Amino acid sequence: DMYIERAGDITWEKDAEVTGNSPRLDVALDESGDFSLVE
Amino acid sequence: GETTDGVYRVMTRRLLGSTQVGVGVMQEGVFHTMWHVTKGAALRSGEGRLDPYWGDVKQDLVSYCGPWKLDAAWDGLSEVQLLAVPPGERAKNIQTLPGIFKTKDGDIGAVALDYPAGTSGSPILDKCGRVIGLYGNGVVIKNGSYVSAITQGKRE
Ligand SMILES: COc1ccnc(N2CCNCC2)n1
Numbered sequence: 001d002m003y004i005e006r007a008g009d010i011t012w013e014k015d016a017e018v019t020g021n022s023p024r025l026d027v028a029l030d031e032s033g034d035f036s037l038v039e
Numbered sequence: 040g041e042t043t044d045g046v047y048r049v050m051t052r053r054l055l056g057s058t059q060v061g062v063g064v065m066q067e068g069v070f071h072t073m074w075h076v077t078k079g080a081a082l083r084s085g086e087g088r089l090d091p092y093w094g095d096v097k098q099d100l101v102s103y104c105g106p107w108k109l110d111a112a113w114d115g116l117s118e119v120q121l122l123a124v125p126p127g128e129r130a131k132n133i134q135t136l137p138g139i140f141k142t143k144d145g146d147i148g149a150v151a152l153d154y155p156a157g158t159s160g161s162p163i164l165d166k167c168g169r170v171i172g173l174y175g176n177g178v179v180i181k182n183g184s185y186v187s188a189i190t191q192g193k194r195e
């Protein structure tokens with residue numbers, strides 16, 4: 001059986017660590033909810 | 040059980056020890072997570088029981104105790120924060136500028152951050168702290184990096 005446990009408040013935090021890039025990707029979404037890369 | 044607004048871990052005792060299978064958001068008495076985390080199954084919150092109310096495998100979303108409540112949207116311009124809740128680790132805000140998933144049905148924001156699979160369902164926030172979507176349904180790109188869609192449901 002599955003259970004939930006609280007992990008925190010939902011807030012924007014000033015001075016959070018900034019990382020990750022911003023790619024533009026052509027994708028497809030199938031009937032099963034899976035995304036795939038289209039080229 | 041616990042109905043306080045906030046971010047929650049989704050756990051199971053079926054495998055070895057206690058295992059985190061995903062994450063979710065409690066807002067206005069409704070629990071919001073990704074479909075692939077629970078497969079639509081009932082959830083426990085202490086001694087209380089959360090039953091599925093709405094779900095869709097194609098959107099990869101599910102709500103418990105009521106209809107989907109999250110309706111904020113990425114503005115297509117500003118940086119956002121992934122409120123990451125990794126297995127066995129503390130909740131941690133990570134700021135990033137989203138990329139784009141271009142599809143035949145329109146464009147969707149995407150966050151290029153890599154976390155273990157049990158982090159699926161962690162909320163993505165705007166500058167006012169509003170949940171603009173959930174992290175955890177995406178693609179593995181050419182370099183092995185994970186890129187998730189900013190997945191948002193519709194509020195009726
Ligand atoms: C947190 O969301 C998800 C969902 C599915 N797979 C993943 N991976 C892909 C491979 N392992 C690292 C990240 N993350």
